[PDB]
Design a protein around this ligand. Sequence first.
Ligand code: CA
Ligand code: CA
Ligand code: CA
Ligand code: CA
Ligand code: CA
Ligand code: CA
Ligand code: CA
Ligand code: CA
Ligand code: CA
Ligand code: CA
Length: 583
Amino acid sequence: AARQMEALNRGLVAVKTDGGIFVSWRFLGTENASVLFNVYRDGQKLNAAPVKTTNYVDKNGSAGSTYTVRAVVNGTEQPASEKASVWAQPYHSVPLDKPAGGTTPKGESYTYSANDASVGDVDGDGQYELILKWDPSNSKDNSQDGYTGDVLIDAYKLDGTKLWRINLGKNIRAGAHYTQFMVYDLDGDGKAEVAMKTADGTKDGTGKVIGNANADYRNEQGRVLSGPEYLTVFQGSTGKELVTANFEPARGNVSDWGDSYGNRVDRFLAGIAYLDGQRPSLIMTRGYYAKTMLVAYNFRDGKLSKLWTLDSSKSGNEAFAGQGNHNLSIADVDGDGKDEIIFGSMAVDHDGKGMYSTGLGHGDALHTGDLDPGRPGLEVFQVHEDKNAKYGLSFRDAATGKILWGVYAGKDVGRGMAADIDPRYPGQEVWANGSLYSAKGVKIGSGVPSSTNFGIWWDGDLLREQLDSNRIDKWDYQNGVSKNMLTASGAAANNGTKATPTLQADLLGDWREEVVWRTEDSSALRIYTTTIPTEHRLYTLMHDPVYRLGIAWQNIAYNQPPHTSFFLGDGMAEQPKPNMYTP
Ligand SMILES: [Ca+2]
Ligand SMILES: [Ca+2]
Ligand SMILES: [Ca+2]
Ligand SMILES: [Ca+2]
Ligand SMILES: [Ca+2]
Ligand SMILES: [Ca+2]
Ligand SMILES: [Ca+2]
Ligand SMILES: [Ca+2]
Ligand SMILES: [Ca+2]
Ligand SMILES: [Ca+2]
């Protein structure tokens, strides 16, 4: 079946460069291969004949010029795109309303920094808003005791308009593994909503407090290990509470999850999955080191409804404990049109049934995509934390879980990457624990790229570049060394040693991915878009099933980079139009 996807505008962007004005725009999932384009500067056509490629350099444009693009569909020109003004800097700043610092019940002062983001179109005009999580400077890993400041979630238009702020309140602890926020048009009306775990004292964007306003379930460890827990869907445009239910997976006893001090119980993940093959569902998970639960919901016709539960503590589900990562993937792995869940070393079917477990246990990085385009199906590359695991890195059939190849490490392998960086080996290369491999498991040369964090499509070629901290690098495959391509001076990455951008996504312009980094003082987000010309046109990545879902889960726990459902890389085949409709 055709999948619900977003009605997007042209995503037209124009950026001042020394060579003139660089202009790029979207090839929309609704458009055929036969569609061409005309480029207009202030109502004047620039190109003598319609162009195919979705980027263009206007040598004679100026900082005051405005641009439109018109599609040419089966010979006739279509109405103009939305108008685009010229970016006077290589990035676009979104000014932020930095939350005031505070002081914990124990007298610890904290301040706020801009942290993980997501995107959704909350008003339905085809341009994304940014949904930003603020992090207090005393946020905590689950292993660490201590009180934390409130978690704040804001919505911003790209012009800097602050639409709202939600304060999750004292009963939601701050830290990577706590709030996992989903931004998506769940009900299919054309407008995104925001869904996340909430509690008594959560304040919506209109200033209305949920539940028992004054209840305080913080224990002396600064953890919230008792009291009600809620799941709320908020209106994207206003941050208003739409509906709130009791949260599942429910806590039960803290000790059910594998410790009594409050670590394992509060290990959350979340996602958007097309469980019915047509429309989105919401996935909320709890646990992964031992007891593990996953619960699916719909938000449709104004109602939240629970669809299924997978609980490893149920007789027959024992194998589905102890396998999850600090991240997950979502993809149709078995070809039935419906999305499955890649939950670290295990997988869960669209109906909530456990599919397989590799038994290799918990890890910190995960990549699900078409890694080996010579092998039908998707593949999963994963690293493993247990020093005694049979493999420190595993490369597997996404659908069956069969190990295609793996390498024993005998130690915690905390990072792993997948990206087509070497055109001499068909498909995506993978690297971890000091070695680079082909998709077939053949070690390539010696050493690895200088980062093992994100892959990003940045330059004009079909290979994928690397992102880490405030840097984009490109692998010189002939010489076996990384070389810097961009250092975003004045921009900072997030999450300490994880060094993740606020967001990486194809948010605007052509198929290359934008990066959103905070400034060092979090007074702004900067949106960088490439001005490197390309000869290639590809469907906007937000119209790919798997990529779009990757953007939805990018924020969760230990942020991972997004992948396409198809092999995008050197030697790739031309892609057909995505099977989609818009609301
Ligand atoms: Ca919008
Ligand atoms: Ca909606
Ligand atoms: Ca499927
Ligand atoms: Ca299935
Ligand atoms: Ca870990
Ligand atoms: Ca494959
Ligand atoms: Ca390759
Ligand atoms: Ca490239
Ligand atoms: Ca782009
Ligand atoms: Ca995160």
